[PDB]
Design a protein around this ligand. Structure first.
Ligand SMILES: [Zn+2]
Lengths: 534, 216
């Protein structure tokens, strides 16, 4: 069932109870977890928090914890599968699901007693009616009904996508509880910006949600400040910004940010030998000295920093980059700490997807989660350093793939693969960073090629996972277009291709468009996908 | 001119308030007045110097940082005087034998990427520059006067506490009190500081191909 009011029939229920949080390892999940943590700590709710990153891990943790806890909250996981089938719970347990994944599984939708969904009912949802999904001429009519059922269920389950941010949902709950702090609002903003950075949502939906959060920012600012008398410099001040699309440009030199932003790198073809000259054309059009552009931004001359955004916008317009400016937010506190929401997103993501072989992925999750609090600001800066390394490695990998021409058409989709032992393949072994790399690589490819048909294709990308088990991760990306809905069918396509091939596919990740394959299975699996997409 | 003195006093007050008000930390953990405490501990240790980061000064007051970058010779004197008076109000009262206040050397540092010796063209003159290199020679420490007193040789009148410009530049003695050069410098009534000239060779990584290494 959908929860109609989070306050009464979710929060006031669990407020009297011991709770278990399962949280996915993504930045939106981390922000929603932080908001809910702060609420529970205000109300002395005895919660336990468990990270998870796949179905096997969630099943293991639930089997470990099922006896002691009756109330469970799943953040950014569980909505798009039958939780009762997967977990096999006792009937007295209750699962709250604040998950952005769409479409919601019909069993979770119509299970009234046990599965409760912390999902907005005014999100883009098209759930089929109950009578269409659940129960001689009567036999013929029944078989016709079953044919209708399979057709409508395939139409419902074909495309997966993402709804409103879980962090935004939790901040809505905090606002209804009248316990919303400025830091909670910042976590909500970072949660939305995670979806925008990873291209999980459309630009229109992102603009709408930014319009929602603008009102909350204005309310929080005018809560205790006006234009006549102001707060201490120590206090956090969140400001709406119509800022630049360039990544981490306030902590870098502008040259590095123009080099490693996927947008500008794809436009100017900076992987190519000619791309640096095109970048120099752009910089000379702006009139910025190269010794200033290659200097760190905080050390750049303030005469140049005065109107840099207008300069970059108006040069980008005539160079063909039509949407260089983006609606976003920034947070200021103290004298010297200034971050964009995209900066916090990249830092936390790099901490979580860090390639270091220390401890465990749960350890990297813990470092990422700690970095979202201002008492652990050093972790945030360290995450920014890791983001520098990650973005440089991303551009190196894209340059390698395009120069050696690993990205190759195979009919209805482009195909690419990373070989073992190549530079910085370890950084993209993990599925989430691989999905991000595939998106950036597809943007670079469609900006590079002259073939108008190839600009319309989706991308399938693979990389090694475990040589000892002989497995590869595989991800599927929809076509990269300006007006895409960011819906993709590769979940069901992978499932149906694997079933039609009897392939050894482990479906452990929460996105259905991310899978693990036994490596030798890839040839017949790819052939099946080619025959399927046709 | 009173307008000029007003400008100097305003800039000195702004540097004073930077050293008085700058903090690091967050409300979730706590705050420490970085340069206040550095001044206090260094003065109590008898060190009489501090190390002001240009990035911190830019964050507090970007105009001061820009002025100190473009015109360091003008503004470093004001910054040092501001540090001296901040040290006075931060440290006093002081025990016996420590009544007289001591001058404070405000060193400074930056997180900016450095330039190079061959990048130092004529347009960089009188600006702040940050260059790497290797020290190949180091002079013995020698005394340079910062303030002098000059006494007329004939009639024994005295001009006292004449401020000497910093650096290797000198001072021109007046030709009017008597002879054409009336004055001699009093060797006792003058205050001097250690100074040391060095030769900074260009980094071998930074030498262009086929060139000998420059030095500065
Ligand atoms: Zn005389």
């Amino acid at each position: 069932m959908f929860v109609s009011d989070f306050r009464k029939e979710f929060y006031e229920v669990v407020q009297s109870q011991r709770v278990l949080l399962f949280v996915a390892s993504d930045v939106d999940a981390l922000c929603a977890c932080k908001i809910l943590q702060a609420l529970f700590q205000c109300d002395h709710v005895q919660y336990t928090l468990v990270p998870v990153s796949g179905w096997q891990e969630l099943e293991t943790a639930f089997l470990e914890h099922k006896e002691q806890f009756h109330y469970f909250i799943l953040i950014n996981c569980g909505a798009n599968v039958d939780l009762l089938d997967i977990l096999q719970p006792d009937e007295d347990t209750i699962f709250f699901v604040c998950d952005t994944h769409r479409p919601v599984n019909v069993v979770n939708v119509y299970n009234d007693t046990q599965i409760k969904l912390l999902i907005k009912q005014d999100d883009d949802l098209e759930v089929p009616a109950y009578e269409d999904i659940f129960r001689t001429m009567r036999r013929r009519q029944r078989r016709e009904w079953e044919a209708r059922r399979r057709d409508i269920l395939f139409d419902y389950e074909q495309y997966e996508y993402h709804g409103t941010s879980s962090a935004m949902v939790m901040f809505e709950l905090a606002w209804m509880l009248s316990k919303d702090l400025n830091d909670m609002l910042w976590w909500a903003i970072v949660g939305l910006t995670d979806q925008w950075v990873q291209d999980k949502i459309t630009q229109m939906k992102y603009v709408t949600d930014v319009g929602v959060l603008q009102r909350h920012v204005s309310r929080h600012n005018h809560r205790n400040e006006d234009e006549e008398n102001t707060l201490s410099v120590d206090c956090t001040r969140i400001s709406f910004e119509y800022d630049l699309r360039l990544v981490l440009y306030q902590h870098w030199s502008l040259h590095d940010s123009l080099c490693n932003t996927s947008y500008t790198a794809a436009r100017f073809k900076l992987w190519s030998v000619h791309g640096q000259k095109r970048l120099q054309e752009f910089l000379a059009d702006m009139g910025l000295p190269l010794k200033q552009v290659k200097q760190k931004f905080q050390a750049m001359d303030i005469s140049l920093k005065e109107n840099l955004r207008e300069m970059i916008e108006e040069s980008a317009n005539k160079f063909g980059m039509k949407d260089m400016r983006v609606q976003t937010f920034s947070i200021h506190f103290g004298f010297k700490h200034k971050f964009l929401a995209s900066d916090v997103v990249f830092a936390t993501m790099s901490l979580m997807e860090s390639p270091e072989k220390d401890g465990s992925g749960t350890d990297h999750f813990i470092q990422a989660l700690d970095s979202l609090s201002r008492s652990n600001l050093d972790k945030l800066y360290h995450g920014l350093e890791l983001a520098k390394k990650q973005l440089r490695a991303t551009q190196q990998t894209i340059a390698s793939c395009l120069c050696t021409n690993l990205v190759i058409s195979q009919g209805p989709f482009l195909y690419c693969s990373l070989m073992e032992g190549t530079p910085d393949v370890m950084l993209f072994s993990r599925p989430a960073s691989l999905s991000l790399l595939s998106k950036h690589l597809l943007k670079s490819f469609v900006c590079s090629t002259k073939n108008r048909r190839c600009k319309l294709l989706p991308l399938v990308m693979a990389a090694p996972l475990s040589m000892e088990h002989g497995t590869v991760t595989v991800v599927g990306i929809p076509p990269e277009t300006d007006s895409s809905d960011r819906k993709n069918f590769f979940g069901r396509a992978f499932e149906k291709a694997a079933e039609s091939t009897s392939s050894r596919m482990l479906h452990n990740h929460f996105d259905l468009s991310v899978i693990e394959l036994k490596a030798e299975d890839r040839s017949k699996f790819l052939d099946a996908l080619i025959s399927l997409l046709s | 001119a009173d307008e000029g003195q007003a400008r100097k006093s305003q800039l000195q007050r702004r540097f004073k308030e930077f050293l008085r008000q700058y903090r690091v930390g967050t409300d979730r953990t706590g705050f420490t007045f970085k340069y206040r405490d550095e001044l206090k501990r260094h003065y109590n240790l008898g060190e009489y110097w501090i190390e002001v980061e240009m990035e911190d000064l830019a964050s507090f007051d970007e105009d001061l940082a820009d002025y100190l970058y473009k015109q360091p010779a003008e503004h470093l004197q004001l910054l040092e005087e501001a540090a001296k008076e901040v040290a006075d109000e931060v440290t006093r009262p002081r025990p016996s034998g420590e009544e007289v206040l001591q001058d404070i050397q405000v060193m400074l540092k930056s997180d900016a990427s450095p330039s190079s010796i061959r990048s130092l063209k004529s347009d960089m003159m009188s600006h702040l520059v940050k260059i790497p290199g290797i020290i190949i020679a180091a002079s013995a420490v020698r005394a340079k006067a910062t303030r002098i007193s000059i006494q007329c040789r004939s009639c024994r009148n005295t001009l006292t506490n004449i401020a000497m410009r910093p650096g290797l530049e000198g001072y021109a003695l007046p030709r009017k009190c008597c002879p054409l050069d009336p004055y001699f410098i009093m060797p006792d009534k003058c205050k001097c500081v250690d100074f040391q000239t060095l030769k900074l060779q260009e980094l071998p990584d930074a030498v262009p191909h086929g060139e000998m290494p420059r030095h500065m």
